[PDB]
Design a protein around this nucleic acid. Structure first.
Ligand SMILES: [Zn+2]
Ligand SMILES: [Zn+2]
Lengths: 44, 152, 151, 66, 148, 50, 82, 67, 115, 62, 260
RNA sequence: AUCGAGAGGA
């Protein structure tokens, strides 16, 4: 029971930590995330 | 290509109502990534109810409250007595399995190919392992966790 | 050039805050050339450190509680293992399973799954390297590695 | 430019990308108004971009300074 | 006493899979008093072991002859009577797994305790009667001595 | 398996059926879809404009 | 907007933490009163972080919504994670 | 341009051996035997004498600035 | 442009202490000796001599940065002993060893030149 | 030929260009380093708006 | 808990090198002695040059650097001279420095070899090694007719930590456990490796049987001298310097302990 | 100092 209660609290806290923050420039971040790998993949 | 992508998406941002919008205030996504989660905290996991067969799914996820001796091996005496005697608890567990079976069909239509690799926020198996080691769980002894407590 | 910009950089752009990238939800920096070849050689099963060598290495742990661990071999001569010192390096009580790059694919099926003849199958428990040879797969920039799980 | 500078993003954001002169000249001919909503427009005017640390305001709490 | 297990083993094979490490060797041994299999990793550089050897193995929870817990910290300046004095090869490790042949309804007739001595791995498997002293995440000592 | 036909057997397991597929060098998705014995559900194209 | 029902997150964002800490550190550097006790701290950033941990920063975050309204949150009302 | 004074590696003096080395070479010694005669036993000092290019002899083909 | 003078590895700056002793609070009976303008030459011998003391539980040293010119020697002893006393005895023992080695090398040279 | 002493450079409020009152270009001109478009995009992704304003307004040409 | 009782055995003593063996000492002591041979045995070397005239094809810093690396006999004088840090004089004095003068002019048609023999000293005890009363003289510069080199140097006391020109050694061979008995090396193919000159093994045997209870003892040394000091003077001065380093450390230690 | 060109570095 103690382990399960701790597990529930841990899941809740980590999930609330995974939520996106208002103000994240996800568009610039996505452009960088898609352009950085483009520099390694082959031209031919 | 990099410059073009940047200039195309530069002002798209997560707003305080949690929608993703551009400079015009038009809505690009009602929630970021369709789930409103940041990409740093998510990680690879496995859906355990996607690939198994119906028999295996039944055998692994249907709580068997009829086998008295198996429950005696898994649970403590008061928990075994409450699970075997009470019918409210048994109906709760039965509906738990039905809900998991519905979830199974939802996953089967979401992932039409049998790929259980998913990217989700919390690594539940690692958290369970952490709880096992933090509280010194003995895997060989019967547990004092009521399955109704798990459901609730 | 201002306290506001300094606080901004300190709370947003500092390197430790930058360990995991949102691009691919994995570490962006990992252990690299000499440290990676050496940690591979160090966590092999037959790495035995003497008392003076162990104290020399413990001088370079910033996060050391000052307690020398009980050596893995007490007799005929006290010897610590490389895994026993990396266990001191590993932080917290993290738990991690990986596999060394030379892990044979038909070992997880047969016997010896939990006692690996080749010292593959990395297992860290409660922040101790219980077994396995650390490598790119365990300390690199991939997902689910020790550095990722630590972060 | 044929997809990004054809949306209603404002002339200053568009001139930052491509066709600086054509975009600004079109905006002049049509009297377009840039509302300064994007990050490019604020960056050009040296103003705090509504991005990250700029997406909100701070106010002093008079009742708590006591 | 603080002894979880004691028996005499006979080296029946050394490195069946071939030599994996230079200074470390895996022994596959079997006892006679309890019929327990043993896989053990030993530093053969300092404590060489030949095929067909016969040794006494003692898994203990402590080295002090009187029942007294250990702190897991290295104390070379300790003058108490330690049972390591009566043995040649001594290692210190922790139990990281206990398998068995248990079913959903039946208990285990045979157990399999796994111990790691700083990476040198041991598996002691046999009757569950002889492996009640083993509990996962518990520190033990090897206490192994060669006999003629 | 990304191009095989992944079905769900009556026992509930995922099974990858090994079936014939055609790859064309041009695109008439409009016409090819409306052909007898052609799957109008999985037949696709890489020309996003079409 | 009804202050009784604020729809934004009850957590302080990383950007809110960054800007609040920077702002309060500048205020301390400009001889503003400190709300917490001080052992020997002389760096405004350390004092601002101590005030944030103590939940004693006298700043209100005005979070704007896309529709144009706003929500005022005291720094003590938000959940500080890092 | 001129023979170094010390061996870069060990610090053995090689400055006084260039002229003797050349004199041994015109005496029909092999370079190895010449280096052995001068006592250069470590391959670092043998490197110093064996790889030296006396450029100063070419710089002395130009008349100085003052007579 | 940025080259430190070569004497800065050996010479103490004004107001800079040759050795500083700081109590280690993590474990009892441990000290950190920060020795300025020394390097592995003294650190290694002091450490290895301290390891010969059975009352020394820990003896280690490090050069925290090669471009910097200090060493730190951590010494932990048994409770009845002291790390300062251990460090002193280690230096005394090294001095006596070097004196004996010097006298014996003088004798060996005299024998070699004579016969 | 590439020695570090011929490459090391620093600036703190040096000379500025005539046309746009921004730092000069080059070590030889005691110029400032270019905070380019890609740096602007990186700091936008970081969300560092005050640092971005410092680099593109206050440290260049207020 | 106490000192070693090292013994010594000198196996060769020439004017050029000393080959000896130290037994019953720790590896750290042996390596600190080896390091002090290179880096903390003071000698005299030119560390100040004033070029009054240089028409040679090598620029001034070339000549100065080249003069600094000429070894100067330092045997009995180095202990007497002071460091200019410690001297209470002006820039220079005879108590902390030695004056050299060089004045050469090529008037004749053949190339004039300005060598270390042209470094004239005020102190007869501190002279260039090659100029000491065979090995030729170190070559400072070759001069053509009409070229001229006139300079004034001052030599100072220093050791190899400050500059390699104050290093008295021309190589310090150091070895221990010639047969790999401690297995501090691990040869993948021990048969492929040549035997040490100090090895005692029959040719069929590649390395000694592993010694589990072994420690590094019996360190072999070959200290070759650049010329400034005699090799045995290098070893004796190394031991004295290491002992004074430890004595100064103990003095400062006592002040720190008593001040607490 | 400006402009251009060229040569390079990553
Ligand atoms: Zn050499
Ligand atoms: Zn003087």
């Amino acid at each position: 029971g103690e382990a399960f209660d701790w597990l529930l609290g841990e899941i809740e806290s980590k999930f609330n930590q995974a939520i996106a923050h208002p103000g994240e420039m996800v568009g610039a971040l996505a452009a960088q995330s898609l352009g950085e790998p483009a520099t390694q993949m082959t031209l031919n | 290509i990099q410059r073009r992508l940047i200039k195309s998406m530069e002002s798209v941002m997560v707003k305080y109502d949690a929608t993703v919008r551009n400079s015009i205030n038009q809505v690009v996504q009602l929630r970021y990534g369709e789930d409103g989660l940041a990409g740093e905290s998510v990680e690879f996991q496995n859906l355990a109810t996607l690939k198994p067969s119906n028999k295996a799914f039944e055998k692994k996820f249907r709580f068997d409250y009829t086998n008295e001796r198996a429950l005696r091996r898994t649970l403590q005496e008061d928990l075994v007595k409450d699970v075997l005697s009470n019918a409210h608890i048994q109906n709760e567990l039965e509906r738990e399995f039905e809900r998991m079976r519905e979830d199974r069909e939802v996953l089967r239509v979401i992932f039409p190919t049998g790929d259980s690799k998913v990217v989700l926020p919390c690594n539940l198996l690692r958290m369970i392992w952490n709880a096992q080691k933090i509280f010194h769980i003995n895997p060989r002894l019967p547990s004092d966790l009521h399955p109704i407590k798990v459901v609730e | 050039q201002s306290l506001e910009t300094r606080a901004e950089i300190q709370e947003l752009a500092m390197v430790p805050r930058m360990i995991v990238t949102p691009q691919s939800n994995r570490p962006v920096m990992g252990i690299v050339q000499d440290t990676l070849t050496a940690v591979r050689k160090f966590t092999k099963r037959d790495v035995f450190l003497e008392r003076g060598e162990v104290m020399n290495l413990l001088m370079f742990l910033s996060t050391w509680d000052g307690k020398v661990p009980q050596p893995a071999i007490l007799k005929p001569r006290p010897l610590w293992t490389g895994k026993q010192i990396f266990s001191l390096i590993i932080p917290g009580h993290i738990n991690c399973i990986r596999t060394h790059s030379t892990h044979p694919d038909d070992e997880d099926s047969g016997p010896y799954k939990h006692i690996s003849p080749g010292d593959t199958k990395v297992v860290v428990e409660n922040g101790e390297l219980i077994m396995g040879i650390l490598c790119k797969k365990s300390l690199g920039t991939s997902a689910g590695s020790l550095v990722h799980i630590s972060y | 430019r044929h997809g990004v500078n054809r949306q209603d993003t404002g002339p200053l954001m568009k001139c930052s990308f491509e066709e600086t002169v054509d975009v600004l000249m079109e905006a002049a001919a049509h009297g377009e108004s840039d509302p300064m909503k994007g990050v490019s427009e604020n960056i050009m005017l040296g103003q705090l971009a509504p991005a990250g640390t700029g997406c909100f305001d701070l106010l002093l709490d008079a009742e708590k300074c006591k | 006493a603080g002894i979880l297990f004691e028996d005499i083993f006979d080296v029946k094979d050394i490195d069946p899979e071939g030599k994996k490490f230079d200074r470390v060797s895996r022994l596959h041994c079997e006892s006679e008093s309890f019929k327990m299999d043993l896989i053990l990793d030993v530093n053969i550089q300092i404590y060489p072991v030949d095929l067909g050897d016969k040794f006494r193995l003692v898994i203990a929870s402590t080295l002090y002859e009187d029942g007294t817990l250990d702190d897991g910290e290295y104390n070379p300046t300790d003058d108490r009577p330690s049972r390591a004095d009566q043995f040649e090869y001594v290692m210190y490790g922790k139990v990281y797994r206990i398998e068995g042949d248990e079913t959903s309804t039946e208990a285990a007739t045979r157990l399999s305790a796994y111990v790691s001595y700083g990476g040198l791995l041991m598996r002691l498997q046999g009757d569950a009667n002889n492996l009640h002293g083993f509990e996962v995440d518990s520190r033990v000592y090897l206490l192994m001595k060669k006999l003629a | 398996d990304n191009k095989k036909k992944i079905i769900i057997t009556e026992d509930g397991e995922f099974k990858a059926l090994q079936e014939w597929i055609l790859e064309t060098d041009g695109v008439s998705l409009m016409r090819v879809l409306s052909e007898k014995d052609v799957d109008p559900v999985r037949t696709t194209s890489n020309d996003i404009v079409e | 907007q009804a202050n009784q029902k604020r729809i934004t997150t009850p957590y302080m964002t990383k950007y809110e933490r960054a800007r609040v800490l920077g702002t309060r550190a500048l205020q301390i550097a400009m001889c503003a009163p400190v709300m917490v006790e001080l052992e020997g701290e002389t760096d405004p950033l350390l004092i601002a972080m101590k005030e944030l941990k103590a939940r004693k920063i006298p700043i209100i975050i005005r979070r704007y919504l896309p529709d144009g309204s706003y929500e005022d949150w005291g720094v003590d009302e938000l959940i500080i994670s890092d | 341009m001129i023979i170094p004074v010390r061996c870069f590696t060990c610090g053995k003096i090689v400055g006084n051996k260039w002229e003797a080395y050349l004199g041994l070479l015109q005496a029909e010694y092999t370079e190895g035997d010449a280096l052995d005669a001068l006592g250069l036993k470590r391959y670092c000092c043998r490197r110093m004498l064996l790889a030296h290019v006396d450029l100063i002899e070419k710089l002395l083909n130009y008349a100085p600035l003052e007579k | 442009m940025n080259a430190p003078p070569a004497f800065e590895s050996f010479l103490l700056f004004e107001g800079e202490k040759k050795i500083t002793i700081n109590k280690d609070t993590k474990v009892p009976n441990a000290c950190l000796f920060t020795i300025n303008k020394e390097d592995h030459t003294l650190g290694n011998i002091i450490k290895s001599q301290l390891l010969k003391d059975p009352q020394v539980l820990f003896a280690g040293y490090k050069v925290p940065h090669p471009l910097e010119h200090k060493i730190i020697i951590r010494v932990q002893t048994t409770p009845d002993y002291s790390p300062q006393e251990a460090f002193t005895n280690a230096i005394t023992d090294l001095i006596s060893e070097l004196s004996l080695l010097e006298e014996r090398f003088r004798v060996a040279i005299k024998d070699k030149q004579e016969g | 030929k590439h020695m570090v002493d011929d490459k090391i450079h620093s600036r703190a409020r040096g000379p500025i260009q005539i046309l746009n009152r921004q730092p000069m270009e080059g070590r030889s001109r005691d110029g400032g380093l270019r905070f380019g478009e890609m740096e602007r995009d990186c700091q936008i992704a970081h969300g560092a708006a005050q640092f971005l304003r410092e680099r593109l307004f206050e440290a260049s040409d207020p | 808990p106490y000192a070693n009782q090292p013994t010594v055995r000198i196996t060769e003593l020439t004017d050029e090198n000393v080959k000896f063996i130290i037994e019953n000492t720790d590896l750290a002591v042996a390596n600190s002695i080896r390091r002090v041979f290179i880096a903390e045995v003071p000698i005299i070397a030119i560390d100040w040059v004033q070029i009054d005239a240089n028409s040679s094809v090598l620029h001034d810093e070339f000549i100065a650097h080249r003069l600094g690396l000429i070894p100067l006999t330092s045997d009995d004088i180095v202990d007497k001279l002071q460091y200019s840090r410690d001297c209470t004089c002006e820039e220079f004095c005879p108590e902390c420095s030695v004056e050299f003068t060089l004045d050469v002019r090529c008037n004749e048609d053949q190339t004039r070899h300005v060598t270390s023999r042209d470094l004239i000293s005020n102190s007869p005890r501190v002279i260039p090694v090659t100029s000491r009363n065979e090995q030729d003289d170190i070559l400072i510069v070759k001069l053509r007719k009409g070229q001229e080199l006139r300079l004034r140097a001052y030599a100072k006391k220093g050791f190899g930590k400050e500059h390699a020109k104050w290093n008295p050694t021309a190589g310090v061979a150091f070895e221990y456990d010639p047969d790999n008995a401690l297995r501090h090396t691990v040869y993948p193919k021990p048969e492929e490796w040549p035997k040490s000159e100090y090895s005692e093994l029959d040719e069929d045997e590649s390395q000694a049987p592993y010694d589990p209870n072994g420690k590094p003892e019996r360190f072999y040394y070959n200290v070759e001298s650049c010329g400034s000091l005699r090799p045995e003077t290098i070893v004796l001065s190394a031991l004295s310097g290491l002992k004074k380093k430890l004595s100064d450390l103990q003095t400062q230690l006592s002040h720190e302990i008593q001040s607490d």
